[PDB]
Design a protein around this motif. Structure first.
Motif, PDB file in Angstrom:
ATOM      1  N   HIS A 127      16.626  -5.607   4.747  1.00 20.50           N
ATOM      2  CA  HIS A 127      17.582  -4.520   5.226  1.00 20.50           C
ATOM      3  C   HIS A 127      19.547  -5.547   4.895  1.00 20.50           C
ATOM      4  CE1 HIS A 127      14.602  -2.863   7.682  1.00 20.50           C
ATOM      5  NE2 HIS A 127      14.948  -2.178   6.882  1.00 20.50           N
ATOM      6  N   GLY A 133      25.562   3.165   8.901  1.00 21.93           N
ATOM      7  CA  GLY A 133      24.824   3.679   7.212  1.00 21.93           C
ATOM      8  C   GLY A 133      25.124   4.963   7.681  1.00 21.93           C
ATOM      9  N   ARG A 182      24.132  -6.592   7.135  1.00 25.02           N
ATOM     10  CA  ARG A 182      22.548  -5.901   7.093  1.00 25.02           C
ATOM     11  C   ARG A 182      23.207  -4.696   7.685  1.00 25.02           C
ATOM     12  NH1 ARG A 182      17.683  -8.307  11.222  1.00 25.02           N
ATOM     13  NH2 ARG A 182      19.495  -7.324  12.762  1.00 25.02           N
ATOM     14  N   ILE A 183      22.104  -3.814   6.794  1.00 20.19           N
ATOM     15  CA  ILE A 183      22.730  -2.133   6.970  1.00 20.19           C
ATOM     16  C   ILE A 183      20.872  -1.767   7.339  1.00 20.19           C
ATOM     17  CG2 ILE A 183      22.638   0.179   6.522  1.00 20.19           C
ATOM     18  CD1 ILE A 183      24.302  -1.048   4.552  1.00 20.19           C
ATOM     19  N   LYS A 213      25.890  -0.107  -1.370  1.00 19.30           N
ATOM     20  CA  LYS A 213      23.898   0.975  -0.618  1.00 19.30           C
ATOM     21  C   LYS A 213      22.509  -0.069   0.032  1.00 19.30           C
ATOM     22  CE  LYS A 213      22.222   3.764  -3.702  1.00 19.30           C
ATOM     23  NZ  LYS A 213      20.648   3.103  -3.694  1.00 19.30           N
ATOM     24  N   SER A 214      22.305   0.050   0.875  1.00 16.18           N
ATOM     25  CA  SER A 214      20.989  -0.466   1.147  1.00 16.18           C
ATOM     26  C   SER A 214      20.125  -0.361   0.096  1.00 16.18           C
ATOM     27  CB  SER A 214      20.285  -0.145   2.160  1.00 16.18           C
ATOM     28  OG  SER A 214      19.169  -0.550   2.953  1.00 16.18           O
ATOM     29  N   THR A 215      19.029  -1.238  -0.699  1.00 16.96           N
ATOM     30  CA  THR A 215      18.208  -0.970  -1.973  1.00 16.96           C
ATOM     31  C   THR A 215      17.040  -0.550  -0.710  1.00 16.96           C
ATOM     32  OG1 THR A 215      17.652  -3.450  -1.205  1.00 16.96           O
ATOM     33  CG2 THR A 215      18.999  -2.313  -3.762  1.00 16.96           C
ATOM     34  N   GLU A 216      17.473  -1.344  -0.121  1.00 17.12           N
ATOM     35  CA  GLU A 216      15.765  -0.574   1.231  1.00 17.12           C
ATOM     36  C   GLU A 216      15.813   0.828   1.623  1.00 17.12           C
ATOM     37  OE1 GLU A 216      13.057  -2.577   1.450  1.00 17.12           O
ATOM     38  OE2 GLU A 216      11.932  -0.897   3.067  1.00 17.12           O
ATOM     39  N   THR A 217      16.238   0.681   2.705  1.00 13.87           N
ATOM     40  CA  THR A 217      16.771   2.495   2.837  1.00 13.87           C
ATOM     41  C   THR A 217      17.694   3.630   2.452  1.00 13.87           C
ATOM     42  OG1 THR A 217      18.608   1.840   3.984  1.00 13.87           O
ATOM     43  CG2 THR A 217      16.653   1.225   4.606  1.00 13.87           C
ATOM     44  N   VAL A 224      24.950  -1.754  11.836  1.00 13.33           N
ATOM     45  CA  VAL A 224      25.409  -2.385  11.282  1.00 13.33           C
ATOM     46  C   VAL A 224      25.205  -3.229  11.924  1.00 13.33           C
ATOM     47  CG1 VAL A 224      26.578  -2.874   9.169  1.00 13.33           C
ATOM     48  CG2 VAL A 224      25.763  -1.029   9.348  1.00 13.33           C
ATOM     49  N   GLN A 284      19.130  -6.502   1.546  1.00 16.76           N
ATOM     50  CA  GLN A 284      19.771  -6.660   0.040  1.00 16.76           C
ATOM     51  C   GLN A 284      20.456  -5.444  -0.371  1.00 16.76           C
ATOM     52  OE1 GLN A 284      16.881  -6.356   1.317  1.00 16.76           O
ATOM     53  NE2 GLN A 284      16.177  -8.708   0.838  1.00 16.76           N
ATOM     54  N   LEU A 285      21.844  -5.746  -0.926  1.00 17.88           N
ATOM     55  CA  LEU A 285      22.730  -4.331  -1.020  1.00 17.88           C
ATOM     56  C   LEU A 285      23.251  -4.275  -2.409  1.00 17.88           C
ATOM     57  CD1 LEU A 285      24.875  -5.559   1.600  1.00 17.88           C
ATOM     58  CD2 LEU A 285      23.247  -3.918   1.627  1.00 17.88           C
TER      59      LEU A 285
END
Length: 140
Positions: free
Chosen positions: A44, A78, A27-28, A60-64, A34, A46-47
């Motif tokens: 957080h 992160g 999780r990021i 890469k975090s798709t959320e942030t 992390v 989903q990468l």
């Protein structure tokens, strides 16, 4: 200078990186820390992985939009932007799992790793043979 056994699969879709050790998803967090969580509903974990060169990836975090990176003292964080500390050598391990070695610190074999309590391991504390470094990329 490491082996070149590569995992199967592609980068077309985002993934969850499930750690075999404690069963945590990598999780990021928005604040750039992390860690891992068992909560599958977390937003957080989903990468999106992408290849820079064969066997080299950004995570890469798709959320942030933050990139997973490992700092000079071996701590994962992160990053707002992609840089040399964000590249990892993605390899197959035990003919099954995916492991990620810090490219910037590859000579020291520093891996991305999650402890059983869900905290990340610091680079120097990771080593081939641990369950902490073993990941299974799961579809989102």
């Amino acid at each position: 200078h490491h082996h070149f056994n590569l995992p199967p699969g592609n980068y077309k879709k985002p993934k969850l990186l499930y750690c075999s050790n404690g069963g945590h998803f990598l999780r990021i967090l928005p604040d750039g820390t992390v860690d891992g969580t068992r909560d599958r509903s977390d937003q957080h974990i989903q990468l999106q992985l992408s290849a820079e060169s064969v066997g080299e990836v950004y995570i890469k975090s798709t959320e942030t939009g933050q990139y997973l990176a490992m700092d000079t003292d071996g701590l994962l964080y992160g990053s707002q932007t992609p840089n040399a500390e964000c590249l990892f050598l993605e390899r197959l391990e035990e003919n099954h799992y995916n492991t990620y070695i810090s490219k910037a610190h590859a000579e020291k074999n520093w891996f991305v790793g999650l402890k059983k309590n869900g905290s990340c391991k610091r680079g120097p504390r990771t080593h081939y043979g641990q369950k902490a470094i073993l990941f299974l990329p799961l579809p989102v």
